[PDB]
């Protein structure tokens, strides 16, 4: 909107109140929008016995199509925007603008792959709060979108050549970060909740759980398949809650034709790490904390007192 001449501003995408605000907003959206038939949340505050809160309510079968949200300045504040096309999200931004609002952000709730988001304008970008810390998530921003077509009939398709090209680009960025002599290896999720072990997302109001092993099973810069990759998926009724610790149960599908196509525009990864003087790095699909999803879009914005 308005470029600030000769201004340097520090950003920290990992400590950004716009992320927290968006998070609470999306939680609220889901309350009024995608109601389960039963929800369970624990309560073990007492000195002994636990007391699970159980709620049973009407659970209408509805469609669910994320719509873009624009965040504008909250009373008393201004939104600053970093214009540097390849900004890692933490540090001095030399080219900063004031804006009325953010661009339109689709609040897609998903694990592992980030869908329908914004692409990097130059090269693929990787962002972490601490790359040296193996327990911190790496946010990947693609510069080219890869299509993923899913169906309630139990599978998602990805073009193998496009995905291969995508992995090579990501691996190049990873070895630029962790050492150019390193072999880069992608492996499946090492375990945890189903929403985290699979590529998990919602399509036509239904929760999909796609086995992503075929997407993350390759070795790069080591030595000197089928047209489409087909991921087997399951739609489920009993879901772990992303909003807070708990479980929700939904009714079975009513549509015999659930189809959607998304653009993969980023990824959430974790590095294995550990004491292993073997020149190679292992990366697995991650996610689960939806604040990371919001950060993948909000990394370039900041709210400040005026």
């Amino acid at each position, epitope marked *: 909107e308005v470029v600030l001449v000769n201004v340097t501003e520090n950003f920290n995408m990992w400590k950004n109140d716009m992320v927290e605000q968006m998070h609470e907003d999306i939680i609220s959206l889901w309350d009024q929008s995608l109601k389960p038939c039963v929800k369970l949340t624990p309560l073990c505050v007492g000195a002994g016995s636990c007391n699970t809160s159980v709620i049973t309510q009407a659970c209408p079968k509805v469609s669910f199509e994320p719509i873009p949200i624009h965040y504008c300045a909250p009373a008393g504040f201004a939104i600053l925007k970093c214009n540097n096309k390849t900004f890692n999200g933490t540090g001095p931004c030399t080219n900063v603008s004031t804006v009325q609002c953010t661009h339109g952000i689709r609040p897609v709730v998903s694990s592992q792959l980030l869908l329908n988001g914004s692409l990097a304008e130059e090269e693929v970008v990787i962002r972490s709060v601490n790359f040296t810390d193996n327990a911190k998530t790496i946010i990947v921003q693609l510069n080219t979108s890869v299509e993923i077509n899913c169906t309630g009939a139990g599978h998602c398709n990805i073009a193998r050549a496009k995905w291969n090209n995508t992995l090579k680009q990501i691996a190049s960025k990873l070895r630029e970060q962790f050492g150019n002599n390193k072999t880069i290896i992608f492996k499946q999720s090492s375990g945890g909740d189903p929403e985290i072990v699979t590529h998990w997302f919602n399509c036509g109001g239904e929760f999909f759980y796609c086995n992503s092993t075929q997407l993350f099973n390759s070795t790069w810069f080591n030595s000197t398949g089928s047209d489409t990759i087909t991921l087997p998926c*399951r739609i489920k*009724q009993i879901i772990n809650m992303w909003q807070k610790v708990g479980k929700a149960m939904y*009714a079975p599908p009513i549509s015999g034709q659930i189809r959607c196509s998304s653009n993969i525009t980023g990824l959430l990864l974790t590095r294995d790490g550990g004491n292993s003087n073997n020149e190679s790095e292992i990366f697995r699909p991650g996610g689960g904390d939806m604040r990371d999803n919001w950060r993948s879009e909000l990394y370039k914005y900041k709210v400040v007192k005026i």
Partner: antibody
Amino acid sequence: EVQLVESGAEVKKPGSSVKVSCKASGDTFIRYSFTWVRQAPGQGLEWMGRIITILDVAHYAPHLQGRVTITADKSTSTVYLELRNLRSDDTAVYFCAGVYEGEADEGEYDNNGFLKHWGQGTLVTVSS
Amino acid sequence: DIVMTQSPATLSVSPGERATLSCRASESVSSDLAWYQQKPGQAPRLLIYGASTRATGVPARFSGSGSGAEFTLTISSLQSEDFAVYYCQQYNNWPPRYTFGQGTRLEIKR
């Protein structure tokens, strides 16, 4: 397929409570939901309530709410019905029934309301 | 409170002939409707669920039809073992408050 074997006949004074049980054998317990249905002599079937075993959540008939509790013991594959503050008109045969819900342990749940498998019934006589 | 009504209360049928049983709901229950058979001293037996789907072990002569608020159980040719009481059951509501009809007694006409 599950076999449902119920506990023996009960005789109670009005004002007492009763706890009847139903042992489920032969399949995976948590993939089933269980329901209790009673039948007064000469009368029809009356739905009392149903427990979603995997969630440990039970729902009850309105006229019964307050004084009925349905529980399940996963470790012994047993379902329980407790009826409190018994009245002479609670005299009935009590049936445990059940139905397969899908791979509940893998988050698949059809929430079926019909009843495929039935216990042999337990007579509960409530009288002075 | 969804009320299920069955008619008639007693149906008299000559052996080997057709029997038609009626179940009506006080409001729509879509296709969430089950039919049971009960003989004296025994537990009910599931014949039909989803209004028209035969349960395993149920002979082809049993047939369920209808949706919404009106349902029919048809037995195309009565065998000796088909004479019993028949109940319908609605399971459409949520929270569940499932209800039964008061039954139709099918007896031998002589």
